Amino acid sequence: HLSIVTLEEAPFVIVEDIDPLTETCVRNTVPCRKFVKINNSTNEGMNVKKCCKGFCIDILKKLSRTVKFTYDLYLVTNGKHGKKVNNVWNGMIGEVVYQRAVMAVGSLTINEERSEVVDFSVPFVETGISVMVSRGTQVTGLSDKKFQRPHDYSPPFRFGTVPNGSTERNIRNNYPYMHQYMTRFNQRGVEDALVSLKTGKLDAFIYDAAVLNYKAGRDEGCKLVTIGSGYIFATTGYGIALQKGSPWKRQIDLALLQFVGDGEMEELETLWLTGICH
Amino acid sequence: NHLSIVTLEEAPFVIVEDIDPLTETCVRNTVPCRKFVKINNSTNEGMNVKKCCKGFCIDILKKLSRTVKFTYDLYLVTNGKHGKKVNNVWNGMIGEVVYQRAVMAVGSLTINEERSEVVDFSVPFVETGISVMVSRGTQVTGLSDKKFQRPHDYSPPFRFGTVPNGSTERNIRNNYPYMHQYMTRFNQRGVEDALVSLKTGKLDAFIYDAAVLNYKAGRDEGCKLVTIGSGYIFATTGYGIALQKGSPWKRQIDLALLQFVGDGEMEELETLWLTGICH
Numbered sequence: 001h002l003s004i005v006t007l008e009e010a011p012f013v014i015v016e017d018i019d020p021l022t023e024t025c026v027r028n029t030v031p032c033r034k035f036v037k038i039n040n041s042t043n044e045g046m047n048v049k050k051c052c053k054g055f056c057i058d059i060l061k062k063l064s065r066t067v068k069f070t071y072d073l074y075l076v077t078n079g080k081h082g083k084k085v086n087n088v089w090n091g092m093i094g095e096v097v098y099q100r101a102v103m104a105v106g107s108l109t110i111n112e113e114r115s116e117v118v119d120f121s122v123p124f125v126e127t128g129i130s131v132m133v134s135r136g137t138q139v140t141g142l143s144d145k146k147f148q149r150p151h152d153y154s155p156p157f158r159f160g161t162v163p164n165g166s167t168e169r170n171i172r173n174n175y176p177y178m179h180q181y182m183t184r185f186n187q188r189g190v191e192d193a194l195v196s197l198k199t200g201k202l203d204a205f206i207y208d209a210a211v212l213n214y215k216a217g218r219d220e221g222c223k224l225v226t227i228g229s230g231y232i233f234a235t236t237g238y239g240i241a242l243q244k245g246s247p248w249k250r251q252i253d254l255a256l257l258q259f260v261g262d263g264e265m266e267e268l269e270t271l272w273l274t275g276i277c278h
Numbered sequence: 279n280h281l282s283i284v285t286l287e288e289a290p291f292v293i294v295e296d297i298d299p300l301t302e303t304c305v306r307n308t309v310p311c312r313k314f315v316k317i318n319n320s321t322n323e324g325m326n327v328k329k330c331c332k333g334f335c336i337d338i339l340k341k342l343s344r345t346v347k348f349t350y351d352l353y354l355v356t357n358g359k360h361g362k363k364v365n366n367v368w369n370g371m372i373g374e375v376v377y378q379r380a381v382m383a384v385g386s387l388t389i390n391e392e393r394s395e396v397v398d399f400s401v402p403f404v405e406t407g408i409s410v411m412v413s414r415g416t417q418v419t420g421l422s423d424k425k426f427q428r429p430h431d432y433s434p435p436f437r438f439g440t441v442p443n444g445s446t447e448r449n450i451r452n453n454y455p456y457m458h459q460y461m462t463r464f465n466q467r468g469v470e471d472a473l474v475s476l477k478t479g480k481l482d483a484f485i486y487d488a489a490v491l492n493y494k495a496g497r498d499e500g501c502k503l504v505t506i507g508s509g510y511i512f513a514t515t516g517y518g519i520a521l522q523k524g525s526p527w528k529r530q531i532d533l534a535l536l537q538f539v540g541d542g543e544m545e546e547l548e549t550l551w552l553t554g555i556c557h
């Protein structure tokens with residue numbers, strides 16, 4: 001009944017293929033589909049069915065047992081989390097804004113531009129802006145002199161983020177020089193940034209706090225250290241996105257508070273999010 | 279001289295001391311702040327007494343009125359503390375802004391959704407939430423530990439409480455009625471009282487604001503206290519400068535705070551006032 005959109009980002013949402021011999025998503029996974037175009041000219045395409053698992057998938061399973069709803073999970077195709085591009089929202093935010101999905105689940109950072117057009121769950125994952133450097137690099141945060149005067153260092157201090165998300169907006173809306181310097185170090189994905197950090201091609205990676213803490217926690221060899229931005233103005237959390245004025249915000253929040261109360265949340269946190277390093 | 283600003287005493291964010299009587303002056307890192315004290319406990323008759331104010335949020339106020347270039351009149355709230363709707367009327371610092379007795383409210387003021395329906399808030403400059411403090415040695419995973427869920431399963435019953443009428447009590451009473459009703463018998467009148475009961479073994483856990491508990495555990499004489507996050511992620515927020523609803527000054531106050539965070543002035547205040555020595 002309920003159309004729910006998600007986005008793949010480990011460890012919160014992990015996407016794998018279905019076994020063709022089964023027609024089944026098994027173990028801890030649930031069925032999720034994707035509308036994939038036939039080529040790069042039309043929008044013509046068809047659904048391909050996949051399997052989805054992760055921390056927020058397990059939250060969705062708990063939510064639809066407790067609130068007692070059935071759902072059809074699908075993966076966003078136009079954009080990622082959410083950005084206003086040419087005055088139209090893309091990503092998961094757009095799917096809720098334009099009422100193609102009743103809910104959006106995943107590593108969706110609650111911010112203030114987004115909550116002008118969608119209603120939000122209570123935060124269930126603490127997040128913000130964090131800085132990750134190679135183990136050995138010493139930075140106090142985003143206010144360090146390597147981030148404010150990068151040309152004082154040889155080579156110039158190399159740091160960047162993943163564009164079009166919650167982190168870039170917080171930098172672009174408040175510190176224009178920092179943002180303009182960063183875009184030449186735009187990192188396409190989390191995995192690319194960690195490779196350049198450990199190989200010495202990047203000095204610092206600015207990104208979401210929850211993702212960076214998880215990646216540093218179970219990194220092969222414990223080579224990555226994460227420190228808070230110090231941008232306390234950007235502290236927030238992941239939230240389930242609902243349509244503006246949604247009648248389900250009340251019951252979705254009540255179920256999440258139950259999980260936080262009875263320990264289901266902390267037990268989910270030690271299944272997916274705990275780390276080993278530091 | 280122009281802007282009336284209300285604050286509330288809570289170390290290390292606001293520390294209140296008396297004026298030197300030979301001078302009538304506030305010197306060093308302190309600024310003049312006044313208090314309206316009643317003459318007795320019968321009428322509302324009273325007079326203003328002048329005091330000196332210092333701390334982390336006082337130093338934020340000094341930077342804001344240098345950068346934005348305003349002069350201010352600092353006074354200490356007398357009816358209530360931070361802010362609560364009592365008999366459908368707001369008291370404390372929130373009430374002073376709601377009823378237009380103060381243009382701004384500065385201090386350990388936690389941003390929540392009930393407060394921001396009647397006042398506007400700066401961007402957060404101190405991240406806070408709900409935290410649990412126990413004696414070093416007590417093992418709790420958070421507020422969802424079964425010592426909190428089922429306190430009567432232990433002998434004696436698990437003794438934990440908070441300070442009433444604040445952000446923490448509202449977050450618990452609005453969502454977990456049994457936990458709140460059990461806590462009120464362990465209501466702590468102040469932070470200092472709760473730390474004494476923890477170190478003497480008369481209280482098992484102290485739920486309170488995260489920033490204050492992290493500071494108190496950081497500078498405890500002997501490092502006797504351990505702080506752990508609530509796990510109540512729904513209650514994560516921060517301290518904010520309270521302004522009247524639709525205030526034209528929220529924009530300029532935010533721009534100055536964002537400048538301090540950008541140029542390192544904030545990190546200089548945080549390691550002068552808030553960093554600790556214990557772990």
Ligand SMILES: CCCC[C@]1(C(=O)O)C[C@H]1[C@H](N)C(=O)O
Pocket residue numbers: 080081082107108109110162163164165166167168207208
């Ligand atoms: C655009 C890919 C990465 C963007 C993210 C960021 O900018 O931090 C991670 C997203 C964040 N959780 C959000 O919801 O915008």
Ligand SMILES: CCCC[C@]1(C(=O)O)C[C@H]1[C@H](N)C(=O)O
Pocket residue numbers: 359360361386387388389441442443444445446447486487
């Ligand atoms: C009135 C007792 C103080 C309780 C507080 C809390 O609830 O944690 C500390 C307050 C908090 N900073 C707020 O703004 O309410």
